[PDB]
Amino acid sequence: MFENITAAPADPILGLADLFRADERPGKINLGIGVYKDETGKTPVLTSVKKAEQYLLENETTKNYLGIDGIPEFGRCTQELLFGKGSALINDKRARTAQTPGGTGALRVAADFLAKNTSVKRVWVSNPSWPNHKSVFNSAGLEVREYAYYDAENHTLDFDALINSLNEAQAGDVVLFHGCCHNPTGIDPTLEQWQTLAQLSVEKGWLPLFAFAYQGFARGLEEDAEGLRAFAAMHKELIVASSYSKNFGLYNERVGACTLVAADSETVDRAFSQMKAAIRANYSNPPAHGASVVATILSNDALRAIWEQELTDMRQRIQRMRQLFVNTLQEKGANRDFSFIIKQNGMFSFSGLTKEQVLRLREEFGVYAVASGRVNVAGMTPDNMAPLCEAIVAVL
Amino acid sequence: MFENITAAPADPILGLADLFRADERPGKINLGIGVYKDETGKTPVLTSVKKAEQYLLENETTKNYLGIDGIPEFGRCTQELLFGKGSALINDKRARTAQTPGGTGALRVAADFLAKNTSVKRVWVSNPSWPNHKSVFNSAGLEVREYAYYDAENHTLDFDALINSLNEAQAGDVVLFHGCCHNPTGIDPTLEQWQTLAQLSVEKGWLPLFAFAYQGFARGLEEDAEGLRAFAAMHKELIVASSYSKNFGLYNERVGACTLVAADSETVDRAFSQMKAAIRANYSNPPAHGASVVATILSNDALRAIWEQELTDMRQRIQRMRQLFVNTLQEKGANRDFSFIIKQNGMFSFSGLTKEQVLRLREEFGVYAVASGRVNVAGMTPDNMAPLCEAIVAVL
Numbered sequence A, B: 001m002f003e004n005i006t007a008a009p010a011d012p013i014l015g016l017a018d019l020f021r022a023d024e025r026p027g028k029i030n031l032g033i034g035v036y037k038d039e040t041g042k043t044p045v046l047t048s049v050k051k052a053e054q055y056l057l058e059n060e061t062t063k064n065y066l067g068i069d070g071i072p073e074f075g076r077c078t079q080e081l082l083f084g085k086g087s088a089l090i091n092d093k094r095a096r097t098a099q100t101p102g103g104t105g106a107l108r109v110a111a112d113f114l115a116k117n118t119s120v121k122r123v124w125v126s127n128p129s130w131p132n133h134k135s136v137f138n139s140a141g142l143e144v145r146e147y148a149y150y151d152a153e154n155h156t157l158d159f160d161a162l163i164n165s166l167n168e169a170q171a172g173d174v175v176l177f178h179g180c181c182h183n184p185t186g187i188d189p190t191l192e193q194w195q196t197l198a199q200l201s202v203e204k205g206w207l208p209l210f211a212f213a214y215q216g217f218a219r220g221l222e223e224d225a226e227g228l229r230a231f232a233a234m235h236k237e238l239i240v241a242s243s244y245s246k247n248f249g250l251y252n253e254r255v256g257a258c259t260l261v262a263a264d265s266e267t268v269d270r271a272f273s274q275m276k277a278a279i280r281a282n283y284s285n286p287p288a289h290g291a292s293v294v295a296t297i298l299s300n301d302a303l304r305a306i307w308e309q310e311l312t313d314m315r316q317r318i319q320r321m322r323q324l325f326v327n328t329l330q331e332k333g334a335n336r337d338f339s340f341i342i343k344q345n346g347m348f349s350f351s352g353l354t355k356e357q358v359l360r361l362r363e364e365f366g367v368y369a370v371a372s373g374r375v376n377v378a379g380m381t382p383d384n385m386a387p388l389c390e391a392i393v394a395v396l
């Protein structure tokens, strides 16, 4: 019976969204979005994926079920993207990929797989992290500890406080790393940090879990995988949960992958069978469409060139807006160094605004940002950059 | 670390499939399939859904995320299909639907919702049932008890043994009913049985969970919902997990719904928020494509008429094959009453073959059936009906 079921709390971004769409004043700016937007303020479906969908509409003959792990070409392509085209990981066939419902679905089936097939009980998540990670790991029954990350002062990666809290993590604990475009701070380890982290991870026996949602948004496709690759070269095991939601603009088709690396193929196959069991008891087998679109873009040279170009344009649009944000702020006139905004990667960064300030922003100007001061740079267009900077100036 | 991870067992149908596709003799028949096939032996994508996909390819402008519960028109249409177009359930707005990854995904999020938000610990599943139900409920942490169902003698619904084991079920236990086309026996309660079951369910305080995977395959769309409707009229609460995988032939697009009925809207909304939380921590929000195809077929009269006709042809093809199976058996010549095959609904029935017999069938003739003697009637075509009957005759 359900009469004393407690309502679910407000989830941050979600609530803000309809609070936004209640504001009678169309001068309003929703910087709390979380999805990419172009200079029009729209989230278009990529030309390459439109081409790949006319193609599938022309060529699918059955909608019969995929295998639990999804379409194989999709798996193989996510492994080259992740590990690099000649990776020993791929040649020794130490990695296995399950196509999953989104990068979140990949984290939930890594979560269940691990919860029921191993000794891990703790997952270390950065402070702060994308908030839904916690919920996923706890629904699985694992507990989430947090490690320090952000220097809420220098606006950088507090590497010391990070290895310092990581030292409470024991062997066989999972430490989640964001592979590139750290949500929420857009602050990422440099390759030298990633490498000493790879080294301290094998030292302390950490099980790395890479949450890789924005490959291609920080510097480029390979560059962004350079951290995971520094880890993978040194680890016998690691798990990576990737998403194609932002970077192929396929948010609602739920396209992502959970990759298992194990020491050798014999072990990766035996753990993967239990990862398949976990998927079976969850949604049985994955959605073919968005993944079918990713596998035919990535395996066609014409189409993958057009996609790449569409992704580097996304990536460059966000890089012009971090710069144009810093300039229109340092010209609508206040004192700050917002220069840290230029250093950070991907769509998000903490502007360093207080809740009293972001609330002010929202009531007095109609600029909507998450209570953490996390601003999504892609909701900025050259047209709204000056009302937005004005507003931020006026509340500083 | 994963080196002593135990491999996952063989799942029945799955294993049989590639054992099938290893048989060098193309006279072979796979009756273990589980998906619909036409007279060609193929699982086509429906004309209506092809039309609905050219339409979506023409009209989608964004692949931005759906809400946790999916596309609303889809929810509204599954509720009319389930509860009937003028249901008080819908008018009083006591029902809430979450679009989910398949009917299995609906069972897993009913499972988690219930496991973490209520007092239920036991779920009663028929003996036998579709085997993945157990796994879903256990991954959620609920335990599965079984109630008797099939009379492995008279080839019917042993109604007595059914209410007799159901009496060990306590109040607040979930009893899962298959709404129509009982997998695996194709044996369904008659409306009089459904009604005394509705009555004994409210008597003992059972929480009904309808697994509704084959609406439209037994007699017709409304007829098939008549059991659920006998229950819904009498229950303050019930959950129904439906799938559009067979009946729209959208297996791999993972299209299904989890509907919550509660006493009133205030309560249904508050339990639904926690069902949304469960989805959030699982795959965040559902795949739009297959559901977007179901919502535009169902809301367009031209397209929904073509779909209906395509579903009644599926349904009639399976009904010709149950009859043609019984005749070609009662003419390839052995003694039995296979007449119970005609009484049963949907794609499956237990032929009443022994494991020693289905194994024989498989080694000596290359007819592949599940070890339970469950035969999928849709894998029978008028062309393979006589090798198949011959084989079954020769092993009786």
Ligand SMILES: Cc1c(O)c(CN)c(COP(=O)(O)O)c[n+]1C
Pocket (backbone or CB within 6 Å): A101, A102, A103, A104, A105, A107, A130, A178, A183, A211, A212, A213, A241, A242, A243, A244, A245, A251, A254, A255, A256, B283, B284
């Ligand atoms: C790290 C991570 C983040 O941060 C997000 C979004 N903030 C997602 C979302 O992926 P999706 O494919 O939409 O489920 C996944 N992952 C794995």
Ligand SMILES: Cc1c(O)c(CN)c(COP(=O)(O)O)c[n+]1C
Pocket (backbone or CB within 6 Å): A283, A284, B101, B102, B103, B104, B105, B107, B130, B178, B183, B211, B212, B213, B241, B242, B243, B244, B245, B251, B254, B255, B256
């Ligand atoms: C009762 C039930 C059965 O029996 C099956 C298949 N045997 C399914 C499969 O639905 P899907 O939409 O493919 O996950 C669901 N349900 C809810």
